[PDB]
Structure formats: structure tokens, C-alpha cells
Ligand binder design. Structure first.
Ligand SMILES: [Zn+2]
Lengths: 193, 173, 277, 200, 195, 243
């Protein structure tokens, strides 16, 4: 799966680097301007992604929860390329999509559209307080003190601490989270009516 | 420090805390007692264009006290996080007044702090000025940082941003 | 632990440079000694020193930034340095048979300017975690002061020797360590029965106040947000509900937040709270 | 003190400053603040009379050097400050007037009630001075012309306002409304600046 | 006043393009003004050399001032030859130089940005390399050079500054910031040194 | 082996409109950036104006002759070239006029100073003299009859330099400008003095900043951001050029 993931990452990287409408590389300029003001994101329009290479859009719209983290990785790599002098510690960039697809009524979201990308309208009636979802999860083995790391994508498929000492038995669940070395992001729950 | 510079004119007209040194007669026209004179060792707030002259001519008539905007609290705030300091609320003309104070008192330590403050804030305002919005069809951080600039930095930012915008508009025409 | 020792010696140098903190430690120690030597008296000064962050920045900017950015690695060494300073300059009086066993580490408190860390419970996002932040607001709830165990001293009536055991929790120590099930060791290594020695053990008070942003500071259309501070020891009962407050502490997180098999797609977060200093 | 009116005056002048900066709306100078000018000028007269009153009272009376010097010195400083505020306001208005004259010598000669009599006379003579410059020796070059470099020799233009027929150097232009030309940029610059042709 | 506010102490990019357009460039003429041995009006210009214009021979490379090469390229009467530095091989070499030396700029010509823009707009069909790649390498060079500038504007002292090899458009766009921050850091220093 | 370039140069040793235009552009570039009012090049501008007049007459005559092959490219090039030259002179003159407006009183006090080493006749053109005089007079009349009429004689001077704040505006001598070190105007290096060769073999100038008591080496073919006061002497000798 490494080869396909790398191919997808490289394809969307080339989309970031090469796309331009008329004399201006829209997404290179947007990425640089976003980095300058410490806005680690990239608002990617969907018509542009369709026009560039419709195969990429097909791959994205097929399994969004598996492709979008790859696109965020590609955005991060492009950001390092165009904002860091070769020879880090740059957060994984966030992909913000803009679409003009037909709006699906909120009551029409049924068994189909599950795991699909849907565009819909409503009125917010509640906003939760900010939570904290971990992205970098520094972790240490309880018995043998085998410190490692876990990286979280936050796009739930449909991950947990390893159930192994992963390098005497150390038990079934030998891992405790090191909270002074982890990195978190804020998450908010809405409620659409 | 031009004569007709409105920024300098407005900077001159800022009240400053200054105590008196003489039991001067007949003054105080608008100082709460027109006819009645001003007592010695009286603390009064005077415009800079007046206190500057009154603190050199004469023992000088008026002794200038350290203003709050250059107090050790503000100095510590400057030395801690220069970028995230709301210098517009401290004084809308902070840099001009700091330059005037250094010129008056030859303060080699206030200057060494305000220059570093200016450099550190110039980095960030260049970052904000050179980042131009692109329409696919203003940022929150840019707008929340532009509220914390004095009348001097608000002009450097305007000039540099206009230059960057003109270059972008020409290149991509 | 070369870095730990380096931080300890650097903070000892800082304390030697600014003698005001040494004078304050001396004043606290002589006040405690005089109160012990002199009755309906209960005013005993706490083992806490308020150091100015400005002095630390002017002395060693690297240490100051380490305190303000990653206090979990810079505050324990500074506290150990303060404890060693107090012990070295202590008047070495006669022991009371309890202070020898009962730990009394010298805690640290901070003041001065914070800059980007002078926050409010609404603007306390997840990018401030593990950093030393100060939040201002109104105390709305205060838990009951409930003592918690941090060290149990045991006497084995077969060898005439005393065995202790340290306890750590997520809400007590900044650095993460293996939690202890808080069960007293009833048997020694060599099959000896032990009796717990209360009064030689060490318990510390524990309170959990709730600080919410001032209602007039709330943005148009939203109710005030709140954060939970965990005051301990000298800082218990320092606040009552309705008090406007400015709490300085380390914005910490705890838990596994899912990532425990029990939750695979469950999208809850971690429990975040401030360890008040 | 005594410069509060002057401080308000220069604050309003700052507003006019940024006001006209704003891109290029070629805004008209906000009507002269005559009322504030009158008050500060009256404030100056009171200060001058106070000096005259003190000087005559110093002569007949027994006044030591201290108060006689100090009161006069403070009044002089206040008068200088008021003069500086008035001068800054007038100089900004004069600079904006000069910019308008230079830019509109090829555009229009105009509400003029926003200007005092002195300012109206100044602008009226300044236009004549500019025309004198454009005719003395630098007559070959159009000193009032555009300051944008002449990139392209040939441009296409669209007629905004109908103007019937206008004679060019050799032929003639029939300025029919909503009709597009393709002519040299040299012979239509004045019309484009005035507001009869639009494109580029 | 006579000179507008935005033209006070800097050059508008149009004026930079005007300055660049006076530099000679090499063209392949599509006409022939060379009078045979066996009438016609000659150029006889006053701000350049007309010798190379009255002696044009079709498909024989000459050198004319850029604003005339563009004027002929408006029709199909010439073909601007791209300068040697404007090829994919040389652009890759310069990019490698920039990535290899993070302290100094590459030796690009002072008009590289302006010339690249002008040639891409008016002479888009005279490049031996695909223009969609030349644009992508020009943008990469601009990005690297912008990264190095932002990390050197961190050295804005009050004495001087050496911006070696910087282009003309980059200097022009950085002028109102550098030359107005250094002025303030100099005024502070001179105020301190009033003794 | 021995070098034979000397004999090769020996066997090869048996005011132009292009140079006039190049000097005009150099003067325009220097004028746009220099804080002070640079001296007027009277001779160059006289030649340039004569050239414009003669070329306009030539274009008119050729057009009349054409008004009776069909090669119109030379005429179009003549017209657009003349337009470009006129624009350059227009911008130069208007920048000088703006600087005159900014520093009117400073120029006046230079004129009235008998100890001054410069004169407006040697630093301003005739039209600039007339414009400066008329503009100063009319602005003086306006300010008088609007503000200074109601002010006493001790506070009626328009050039009071003895007040609380100096009211004559001087050019910012220590302003920071972008300089490109041309080197000596001629192609020969050893002939020109002040060119202390630096290490690494690159020749360089040497200028000292009195405020900081610092010596900086101005390498040839390099771009600097230097104080204008330090550069003024080299700039007057065309050894450097303002970018
Ligand atoms: Zn293990």
C-alpha cells in the first residue's frame, strides 16, 4: 500500500505545484500567503481539482476518508519545499474544500452517502466547547520503557494504542501516553438543523 | 521631525507627567486656575511641545517625570513578546514619542529596547504586508494584528503592502 | 539525567545572582522557626517563593523560554534547586521526628509579564497545552478540600526499620509517570508484616476550582466558557465562588481519549485542566 | 490648555489626509473648517492682548524679571503651537490643491465652494503658473501629461459619453457613443483623462 | 504636488518595465531593410542606434532595443530570441545554486523577472523549451529568492546592508520597507547618541 | 608563457545621442531616489531639448512628404521613441519640481546665504527658478493673509529657525538609499584613486560612517543599502548609481 499512497501523494503534490489558470500559480501563492500569516491550511476548490486531472477527483470522491490525509501530507510536503531552505517541525496542514455540487437536503442523507462527500445547508443550533484530539502521541512502554511515537490522521475510517510491548512480555496493554511530549489539536462539535 | 508633519504635530500634543520647580506667578491660564498662580513642587500634566521647552530653560522651571508608557512594566512587556503587544492602546504615537524621549534624555537603554522592539515587529508586519489574498472564484490573523500598530507602523505597513500589491498586479496582469 | 542536573545548577546560579529570593527564603525559615519556638498560634508560612519571570528572562533567556514553553521539563529542576537552596541555608535545628519523613519540597510561583500566555478561558485553545499560561476569570465552583496521599511511611515491627513509598498521580506531578494503585504495602520484601505510620506519612490537600471567563468579555451571542484549575497544598481555599481571579499554571491534558479499543470511531477528546501554581 | 482647538484642527487635517489618500477618488477637500480657524485665531488675539496687557502692566507696575519673563515666554510658546497647527492644516490643504491642479490640468477646471477666497485665488493663479511652465521652454514635452510610461503605442478605446465630432491632428474622430476605436495612444490621452474614452 | 504620493521615492513597476525595455535584445527579423546595390525611410532614431535596424536581413540575428523588438513582434515581423539564461538547463542550474548556497543569491541578471514576464506575454511562441516549464522554474526561483530575502530582512541594522545579486524588481518592491525601517532604527540610534 | 596582449592593444590603438539618453536615464534614476535636490545638467538637457525639437520637425516634414514604398514602421518607431523620451524628461522635471516644493525655504536660505558654496543658478534651471520664485511668493501671500496677518511680528516670519522647532525643512542627508557600485566611469581601474583593492582580488571603495565610526568596503559590482550622506561624494562622481 506504500506505493499507491506515495503515488497519490505525488499526484496531489504536482496538482499543488503545477496548477495555474492564467500566469499565476493559484495554490502555490495561496500556500505561501497562508504560511506567512501562520495559517497552516489550504482552501482547495473542487472545480480546479476536477479540471486539472479528473482521475484525482474520482479517487478523492470514492474514498475521501482515506485519500484526504494523503492530500494533507502532500500539502505539508509542498509547504516545506516552498517555505523552508533545504539544509522542520511544521504542523500537518489542513485541507479545506470548496464545492458547488448540488446540495443534498439534510433529511435526504440516508444509508447511501455514507462515507461520501455531501454538500448540505442548515442552521447551526449548538456549538460545543473545544475538545483536544491528539495528533502526535508520544508513548512509552510501562515495563521496559520502550518510548515510541504514534501519528494520528483524525479521519476515522468507519486507531488505538498498540496491544503489544512492540519492543519481558510487558503485558497486553503496556503503553501509557506521555502527555508532556504529545501534540494536540482542537476539535468542536456542531449541531445542524 | 518635519515642521508640517501632522504625525509629529499630534505627537507633540500629548500630556506628560511633570512636577514644577518654582512657585511661578500668574500662570495656569487653563490649568484649573487662570488668575491664580501655580505653586512650587506641583505635579501637572503638560503637552510635550510645552514640557520639552519648560524642562530646559531656566534650575529648570519644570521637572519631567518618567511617563507610564515608558515604565518598567511596559519595558518588561516589550522585552517579553514584542510581536503580541497592543502598542496602539499604550500610545497611538509610541515610536515618535519614544524617539523624542531618547533625544531629550540621551537614554542609551530605552533606545536599545525600542530599536529591538521595532525590528521584531517589523518582521511580522512585513510578513502580513507581503501576504496577498487570492480569490479562487482578509485573514483573521492579519486583521487582529493590524489593530496593534501605532500611527507610524500603520504607515510603513500601508506603503509596503501597496508596493507588494502593485508588483503582484503588474506581474499577473 | 545530565540535562536535569544542568537545569538544577543553572537555577541555583540564578538564585545566587538575585539574592532577593534567598532573603525571602531566609525570612520564611526564620518566621517558621520563631512560630515553632513561640499558644493559640497557627500562622505558619508556606514553602512557596514567587519569582519574577522578568528577572529570569534577563538572567538566562533560554531558561525563561523553557519555563514559559515547556515547564514540564524546567519547573521540576527549578523546584529541586530551590529545595536544595533552602536545605543548605537551613538553620539545621533539631528534628521533630516528622519533618524528616514528611516531604516539604519548596514549590515555585511566578509573576511578571507573560505576553502571548496572558489568556482567558475562552482563548485557551489546544495549542497552549503543556505550556505555562495565566487565565483570568470568575471562580464559579470550588470542590471540597480532600487530602490526597503522596507518600506512605511504614514501620516493620520485626527489624526496627522504616520503609516508605512515594505515590504519583496525573494531577500532582508535571512529568508523566506510571500511576500507583494507591494501595499500602502490607508485606515487606522479606515476608515481614508492616503497619502504616500515619503522622509520618505525607498527605497534601487537593481542590479543583472552576474558572470561567468574565461575562462581559464573552463575544456577542455566546455564553462564557470555563476551565478547571487544580489547586493543591498552600493554594487550597485561596478562592471562593464569585471571586475574580488570575490563575497561573501549566495547561495540562490527561487520559487516552479513546485510543483504548473501547473507542474506535468515538470522537471524544482528552480531559484538559490547569495545574495552578 | 490653549492648543486644544489646534489639536482638533490637526486631527481633522489627518482625516482629510487619509481621506484623500484612499486610492484615487480625487475627493474634494472637505469644506474649509472656517469655524475652528476663527476660534483659534480669536484665541491667538486673546493671547496677544494678554501679552500687551502684561507688558504695559510690567512697565508701570513693579514686576520682577521672573514673572514678566515666564508669563510672556509661556504665551509665546502657546502662540507658536497654534501657529504650527494652523500652518500644518493650511499646508496639507495646499498640497492637496497642488495635486488636484497638476492632475486636472488635463481633466477639468473645477464644487469650488469648499475653498476659501485665499485658496481659490491660490488655485486660480497656480493653474496660470503651471501653464507658464508648460510654455516657457519645456513646450516640446507636455509637462502636464501622464506620468505612466508609454508602454504601447496603439490602443483600442470605447466612447463613454457622446461628443459628436472632434478634430484630431490629421483626420477626425467621430465620438459616437458605444463605438470602439483602434488608434494611437498619443492622440487620445487627453480625452481618456477627461472621461470620454474608457478602454486602457 | 507635481509627483504623486505613490511615486515619491520608489519606481512603479510600470517604470521598471520601461527601464528594462531599453536594454538590447537579439532578434530574428522577418523583414529585410538592407538596401540592395541596384524610396525608403530609415529609422534615424535619437535615443538608440539605428544602424542595426536599417541593415536587417531576414532570419539573420541582430540586436535591437527591447521596446523595438516588442513593437516588431506586435506584427509577425520579427522573432525575439530568448536569452541564454532563460532556458530550462540554466534555470535548473540557478535553482541548484540557490539550494546549495543558503546565504547568498544566485547570479541572475538584474532584469530577470521583468524580462521573463515580458517575453512570456509578448513572445510566447519563440522559446525552444515548453513555456509551461519555464514558468514553473521562474516561479521556483522567485520562491527561493523570497525565502532568502525574508531571512535577511532579519538583519536590518542601522549602518548598512549588502543585498548582493538581488534583482531590480525585488529591490523595487522591498525598497519602501527596508529603507523606512532602517531610517527609524537610525533615528533611534542618533537620538541615543546625542551626547 | 609571456603575455602578448600589450602589442595586440598597440596595433588596435590607431558626445553621442545614445550617451545623452543614457546620461538622462542615469540622472532620472538618481533624482527619483536621492533625498537632496541634485544639480541640474544644463548642457545635457539643452542638447536633449534640441534633439526633440529637431526630431519633431523631421517627423512633421516626413509626414508632409507622405501626405502627397508604404513603409510606416520607421515613422511609428520615431513617434513612439519620441514619446518615450518626452516621458522621461517629463518625469524628471516633475520630480525636480516636487523636490523644489518640499525644500522651498531651504533653497531660499541657500540663495540668501553669501557663505553658501552653491547657487540656484548653478543648481536649478531657469524655469525651475521662475517656478520656485512664483510659488514661494504666492504661498507666502496666502499664508500671510490667512494666518500670519493675525500674528505678531516676532511670530510672523515664514522661515523662523530660532523657534521651538525648526521651521525650515532640510533634506534627510542620512536617508537610506539603494546603491549599485558602478566603479570608475571609465573602463580603467588603476587610473582612478580611492579604489583600495580589497582581499580576494575584488577592487572596492572605502567610506566611513561618522556616527558609528565604522569603515565599510564598497565592493565594485555589488548592491548596498547605505546612508545617502556617506555616498554623496561617490554619487557626485558617478562611481555609484542609485538603484
Ligand atoms: Zn515493553
Amino acid at each position: 500500500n506504500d506505493d499507491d499512497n506515495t503515488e497519490i501523494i505525488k499526484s496531489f503534490k504536482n496538482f499543488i505545484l503545477e496548477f495555474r489558470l492564467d500566469s499565476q500559480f493559484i495554490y502555490r501563492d495561496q500556500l505561501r500567503n497562508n504560511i506567512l500569516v501562520k495559517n497552516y491550511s489550504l482552501t482547495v476548490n473542487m472545480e480546479h481539482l476536477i479540471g486539472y486531472n479528473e482521475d484525482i477527483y474520482k479517487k478523492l470522491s470514492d474514498e475521501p476518508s482515506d485519500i484526504i490525509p494523503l492530500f494533507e501530507t502532500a500539502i505539508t510536503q509542498v509547504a516545506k519545499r516552498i517555505s523552508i531552505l533545504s539544509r522542520n517541525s511544521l504542523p500537518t496542514f489542513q485541507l479545506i474544500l470548496n464545492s458547488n455540487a448540488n446540495q443534498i437536503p439534510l433529511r435526504d442523507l440516508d444509508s447511501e452517502h455514507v462515507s461520501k462527500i455531501v454538500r448540505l445547508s442548515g442552521i447551526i443550533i449548538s456549538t460545543s466547547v473545544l475538545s483536544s484530539r491528539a495528533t502526535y502521541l508520544s508513548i512509552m512502554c510501562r515495563n521496559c520503557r520502550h518510548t515510541t511515537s504514534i501519528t494520528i490522521n483524525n479521519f476515522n475510517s468507519i486507531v488505538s494504542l498498540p496491544r503489544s510491548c512492540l519492543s519481558k512480555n510487558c503485558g497486553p496493554d503496556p503503553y501509557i501516553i506521555i502527555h508532556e511530549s504529545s501534540k494536540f489539536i482542537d476539535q468542536q462539535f456542531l449541531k445542524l438543523q | 521631525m518635519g515642521y508640517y508633519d501632522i504625525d509629529d504635530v499630534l505627537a507633540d500634543g500629548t500630556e506628560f507627567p511633570c512636577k514644577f520647580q518654582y512657585d511661578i506667578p500668574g500662570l495656569g491660564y487653563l490649568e484649573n486656575n487662570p488668575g491664580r498662580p501655580i505653586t512650587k513642587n506641583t505635579k501637572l500634566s503638560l503637552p510635550l511641545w510645552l514640557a520639552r521647552i519648560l524642562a530646559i530653560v531656566g534650575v529648570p522651571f519644570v521637572e519631567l517625570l518618567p511617563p507610564d508608557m515608558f515604565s518598567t512594566k511596559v519595558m518588561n512587556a516589550i522585552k517579553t513578546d514584542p510581536v503580541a503587544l497592543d502598542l496602539h492602546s499604550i500610545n497611538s504615537h509610541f515610536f515618535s514619542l519614544a524617539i523624542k524621549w531618547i533625544m531629550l534624555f540621551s537614554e542609551k537603554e530605552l533606545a536599545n529596547v525600542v530599536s529591538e522592539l521595532l525590528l521584531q515587529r517589523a518582521q511580522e508586519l512585513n510578513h502580513h504586508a507581503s501576504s496577498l489574498s487570492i480569490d479562487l472564484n482578509t485573514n483573521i490573523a492579519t486583521s487582529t494584528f493590524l489593530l496593534k500598530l501605532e500611527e507610524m507602523e500603520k504607515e510603513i505597513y500601508k506603503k509596503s503592502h501597496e508596493s507588494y500589491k502593485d508588483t503582484k498586479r503588474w506581474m499577473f496582469k | 539525567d545530565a540535562v536535569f542536573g544542568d537545569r538544577v545548577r543553572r537555577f541555583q546560579e540564578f538564585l545566587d545572582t538575585f539574592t532577593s529570593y534567598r532573603d525571602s527564603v531566609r525570612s520564611i525559615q526564620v518566621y517558621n522557626s520563631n512560630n515553632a519556638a513561640n499558644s493559640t498560634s497557627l500562622n505558619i508560612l508556606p514553602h512557596r517563593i514567587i519569582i519574577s519571570l522578568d528577572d529570569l528572562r534577563e538572567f538566562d533567556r533560554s531558561f525563561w523560554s523553557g519555563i514559559l514553553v515547556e515547564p514540564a521539563y524546567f519547573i521540576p529542576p527549578a523546584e529541586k534547586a530551590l529545595t536544595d537552596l533552602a536545605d543548605s541555608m537551613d538553620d539545621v535545628p533539631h528534628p521533630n521526628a516528622s519533618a524528616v519523613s514528611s516531604r516539604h519540597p519548596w514549590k515555585l510561583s511566578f509573576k511578571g509579564s507573560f505576553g502571548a500566555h496572558a489568556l482567558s478561558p475562552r482563548t485557551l485553545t489546544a495549542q497552549h497545552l503543556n505550556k505555562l499560561v495565566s487565565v483570568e476569570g470568575i471562580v464559579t465552583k470550588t470542590s471540597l478540600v480532600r487530602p490526597k496521599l503522596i507518600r506512605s511511611v511504614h514501620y516493620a515491627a520485626k527489624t526496627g526499620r522504616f520503609h516508605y513509598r512515594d505515590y504519583t498521580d496525573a494531577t500532582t506531578t508535571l512529568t508523566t509517570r506510571i500511576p500507583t494503585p494507591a494501595i499500602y504495602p502490607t508485606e515487606d520484601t522479606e515476608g515481614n508484616k508492616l503497619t502504616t505510620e500515619y503522622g509520618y506519612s505525607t498527605f497534601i490537600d487537593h481542590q479543583r476550582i472552576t474558572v470561567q471567563e468574565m461575562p462581559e468579555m464573552a463575544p456577542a451571542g455566546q455564553l462564557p466558557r470555563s476551565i478547571d484549575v487544580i489547586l493543591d497544598d498552600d493554594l487550597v481555599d485561596k478562592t471562593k465562588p464569585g471571586d475574580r481571579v488570575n490563575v497561573v499554571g501549566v495547561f495540562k491534558s490527561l487520559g487516552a481519549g479513546g485510543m483504548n479499543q473501547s473507542n474506535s470511531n468515538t470522537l471524544i477528546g482528552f480531559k484538559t485542566l490547569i495545574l495552578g501554581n | 490648555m490653549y492648543g486644544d482647538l489646534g489639536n482638533k484642527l490637526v486631527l481633522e487635517a489627518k482625516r482629510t489626509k487619509q481621506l484623500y489618500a484612499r486610492s484615487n477618488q480625487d475627493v474634494n477637500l472637505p469644506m474649509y473648517h472656517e469655524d475652528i480657524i476663527r476660534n483659534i485665531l480669536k484665541e491667538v488675539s486673546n493671547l496677544r492682548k494678554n501679552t500687551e496687557y502684561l507688558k504695559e502692566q510690567q512697565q508701570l507696575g513693579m514686576l520682577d524679571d521672573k514673572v514678566a519673563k515666564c508669563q510672556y515666554f509661556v504665551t509665546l510658546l502657546c502662540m507658536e503651537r497654534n501657529k504650527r497647527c494652523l500652518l500644518a492644516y493650511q499646508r496639507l490643504r495646499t498640497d492637496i490643491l497642488d495635486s488636484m491642479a497638476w492632475n486636472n490640468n488635463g481633466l477639468d477646471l473645477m464644487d469650488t465652494n469648499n475653498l476659501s477666497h485665499q485658496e481659490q485665488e491660490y488655485l486660480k493663479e497656480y493653474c496660470d503658473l503651471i501653464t507658464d511652465l508648460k510654455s516657457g521652454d519645456l513646450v516640446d514635452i507636455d509637462l502636464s501629461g501622464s506620468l505612466v510610461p508609454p508602454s504601447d503605442v496603439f490602443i483600442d478605446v470605447r466612447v463613454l459619453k457622446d461628443a459628436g465630432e472632434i478634430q484630431t491632428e490629421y483626420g477626425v474622430f467621430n465620438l459616437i457613443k458605444d463605438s470602439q476605436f483602434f488608434v494611437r495612444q498619443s492622440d487620445v490621452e487627453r480625452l481618456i483623462q477627461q472621461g470620454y474614452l474608457q478602454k486602457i | 504636488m507635481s509627483l504623486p504620493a505613490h511615486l515619491q521615492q520608489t519606481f512603479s513597476p510600470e517604470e521598471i518595465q520601461f527601464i528594462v525595455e531599453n536594454e538590447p535584445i537579439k532578434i530574428f527579423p522577418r523583414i529585410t531593410t538592407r538596401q540592395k546595390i541596384r524610396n525608403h525611410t530609415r529609422w534615424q532614431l535619437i535615443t538608440t542606434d539605428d544602424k542595426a535596424l536599417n541593415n536587417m536581413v531576414a532570419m539573420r540575428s541582430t540586436e535591437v532595443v527591447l521596446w523595438i523588438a516588442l513593437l516588431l513582434k506586435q506584427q509577425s515581423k520579427c522573432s525575439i530570441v530568448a536569452p541564454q539564461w532563460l532556458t530550462t538547463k540554466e534555470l535548473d542550474r540557478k535553482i541548484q545554486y540557490e539550494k546549495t548556497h543558503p546565504d547568498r543569491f544566485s547570479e541572475l541578471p538584474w532584469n530577470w523577472l521583468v524580462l521573463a514576464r515580458i517575453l512570456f506575454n509578448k513572445a510566447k511562441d519563440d522559446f525552444h523549451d515548453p513555456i509551461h516549464e519555464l514558468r514553473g522554474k521562474i516561479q521556483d526561483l522567485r520562491e527561493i529568492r523570497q525565502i532568502k530575502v525574508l531571512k535577511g530582512l532579519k538583519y536590518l541594522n542601522e549602518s548598512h546592508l549588502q543585498l548582493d545579486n538581488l534583482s531590480l524588481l525585488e529591490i523595487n518592491e522591498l525598497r519602501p520597507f527596508i529603507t523606512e525601517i532602517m531610517d527609524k532604527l537610525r533615528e533611534i540610534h542618533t537620538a541615543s547618541l546625542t551626547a | 608563457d609571456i603575455n602578448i596582449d600589450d602589442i595586440l592593444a598597440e596595433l588596435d590603438k590607431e558626445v553621442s545621442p545614445q550617451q545623452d539618453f543614457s546620461d538622462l536615464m542615469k540622472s532620472w534614476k538618481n533624482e527619483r531616489c536621492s533625498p537632496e535636490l541634485l544639480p541640474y545638467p544644463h548642457q545635457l538637457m539643452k542638447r536633449l531639448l534640441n534633439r526633440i525639437s529637431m526630431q519633431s520637425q523631421l517627423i512633421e516634414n516626413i509626414s508632409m512628404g507622405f501626405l502627397d514604398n508604404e513603409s510606416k514602421l520607421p515613422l511609428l518607431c520615431m513617434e513612439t521613441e519620441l514619446e518615450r523620451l518626452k516621458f522621461v524628461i517629463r518625469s524628471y522635471i516633475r520630480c525636480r519640481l516636487s523636490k523644489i516644493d518640499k525644500f522651498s525655504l531651504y533653497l531660499r536660505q541657500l540663495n540668501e546665504d553669501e557663505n553658501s558654496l552653491i547657487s540656484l543658478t548653478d543648481l536649478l534651471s531657469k524655469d525651475e527658478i521662475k517656478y520656485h520664485d512664483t510659488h514661494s511668493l504666492i504661498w507666502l501671500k496666502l499664508v500671510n493673509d490667512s494666518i500670519l496677518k493675525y500674528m505678531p511680528e516676532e511670530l510672523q516670519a515664514i522661515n523662523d529657525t530660532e523657534g521651538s522647532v525648526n521651521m525650515i525643512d532640510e533634506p534627510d542627508w542620512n536617508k537610506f538609499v539603494f546603491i549599485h557600485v558602478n566603479g570608475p566611469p571609465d573602463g580603467k581601474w588603476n587610473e582612478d584613486p580611492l579604489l583600495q583593492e580589497n582581499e580576494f582580488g575584488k577592487p572596492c571603495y572605502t567610506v566611513t560612517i561618522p556616527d558609528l565610526k565604522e569603515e565599510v568596503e564598497l565592493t565594485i559590482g555589488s548592491i548596498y543599502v547605505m546612508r545617502y550622506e556617506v555616498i554623496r561624494d561617490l554619487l557626485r562622481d558617478d562611481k555609484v548609481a542609485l538603484i
